[model samples]
Target: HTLYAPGGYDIMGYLIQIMNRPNPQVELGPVDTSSALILCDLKQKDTPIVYASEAFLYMTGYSNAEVLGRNCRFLQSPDGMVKPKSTRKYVDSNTINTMRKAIDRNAEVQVEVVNFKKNGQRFVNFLTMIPVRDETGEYRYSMGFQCE
Candidate 1:
């Protein structure tokens, strides 16, 4: 099952080319103005970050250099962090598992997870991710959008 963009160019190559060389005629759609945008390489372990939009940096208070090549789980607060006994503020295993299931199935999913900023301030992250495929229908990347 080969995947292709309109007009038959390879989807992966087309996306890379668009990133390196902008085509004024192309409309990137609503995702361009999202509060936070992250691109992950599914081929890598833990789906390491390949790109992070400036808005993502602004939301998480992390510079682009600190995010690239890191897993998105970095946003998860450390397990040792003490929270009010009444409420927990860490990324739960269930949420992680759900995301993994979705990725494995190449499905789009939306979830809200507890996340922390670089400053250690906790916030609820509204997250959504959709898998991107290359020719032959192999998952190449996952595009994630988040807002806190």
Candidate 2:
């Protein structure tokens, strides 16, 4: 029998493999507590399921409790939806949706827009989404990397 339903995944071993990829040597630079590094899973309800580095938490004034399992759109404006007048308003849910669609269509891009942190302070982010695939050629979650 063949099953056709969404949301069936096993990540236990996959995560181990990813963590073992490699670590490159680097010089110690000044800590950037203002930039955020977020890894979001678009396939699983579109949220940051895991691995949001410390810089991500500090920059957004949100601990792991607030961000994990939550859509990145919360980083957008809190007005339900904001008008796109200035650069700051570009970080609305529409931006996230746009990126999601691009990945669904197998495209990679760099987007510059303003996103709001938990403290309501807006910051410009350079967003990149890398589409990942599985052995069966299925679309896996997206790897969302962010920087200020």
Candidate 3:
């Protein structure tokens, strides 16, 4: 039941501010969770992460500093490769392209990706992303959930 947000990161207040503007319903789903959740600001360039769950920090072996304000591409482990004795090409784009298309269309997509930990170990990352809208039907944010 541990979650970390910045000092002024009370998204509840921020949401309420905008939510008062004709959006009576919050499409943001359940927040009481142990699931590895990462929230990104849709209006931001590259959709940098705005919030992350405790489970997400623990799962990815990243702390608050290492995880915040960055693109998620830092975690990619192309083709699910384990530790390589000899260096090889890291040029697989299938999974990444699928994710791009999904977000571009503001749709939900789930796929197993080879995600790297902070320690550089590759894990089978079962990941999904979905976009949420306000009651005013505006694209508010994007949510990502991942598991081992």
Candidate 4:
């Protein structure tokens, strides 16, 4: 999608704390996630859900309906998660990829990243997505928490 912000990057970057800019900047941190804190039925692709906190909606420019059911990977940049290419050598130290591996293994994972928000804007987020199962050992749902 062609994403357009109202005013260049000044207001948008300011909202997410991009650094080294003329506008007031929030300190730069790890780029590990998107603005939407999404949840879903682990076995049901269409059963996506979100708590839809006010802060989440404001950051991603996504209403609840816009984000639910979408893969969190949708928030990734065209370049994907790794940065600088040189950093790829440190595979174990790559936080987001590590978290993704853990989640596929049904482990609770916490990661930090700069992820694309719904407006096609990107922001840093602290994310925790965990899987919970039913009594019969069937995967039930996943839960998520996000911090900007």
Against the correct fold, how does model 3 do in TM-score? 0.70
In model 1, state the lDDT of residue 107.
76
Task: Report, for all candidates in order, the number of backbone clashes.
Answer: 0, 0, 0, 6
RMSD of each: 9.3, 8.1, 7.9, 13.9
- Candidate 3 residue 9 Cα shift, in angstroms, is 6.6
Model 2: ten consecutive residues of lowest lDDT:
24-33
Give the range where candidate 4 is weakest over 10 consecutive residues by summed lDDT: 1-10
Q: Is candidate 1 or candidate 3 better by lDDT?
A: 1
TM-score of model 4 (CA atoms): 0.53
lDDT of each: 0.68, 0.55, 0.65, 0.50
Reference-based lDDT, residue 54, model 2: 72
Clashing pairs in 3: none
**Stretches of model 1 off by over 4 angstroms after superposition:** 1-29, 78-89, 135-137
Identify the runs in model 4 with alpha carbons over 4 angstroms from their true place. Answer: 1-36, 45-54, 78-96, 134-138
Q: Which runs of model 3 end up more than 4 angstroms from their true locations?
A: 1-32, 77-91
lDDT of 4 by residue, 1-148 (tens): 2222233222222223323324321233432235544445555443345334556667666676665545555445523343332344323346756765765676666777666666566567777665544445555555556777
Write the residue-wise lDDT of candidate 2 on 48-98 in tens digits.
445466777877778877766666666667442433233444455566667
Model 3 Cα lDDT, one tens digit per residue, 1-148: 2233446344453334433434423244444346787777676766667787889889888887776666676677433232322233442467777777888788767888777788776788888776756446777676677889
Ranking according to lDDT, highest score first: 1, 3, 2, 4
Residue pairs clashing in model 1 are none
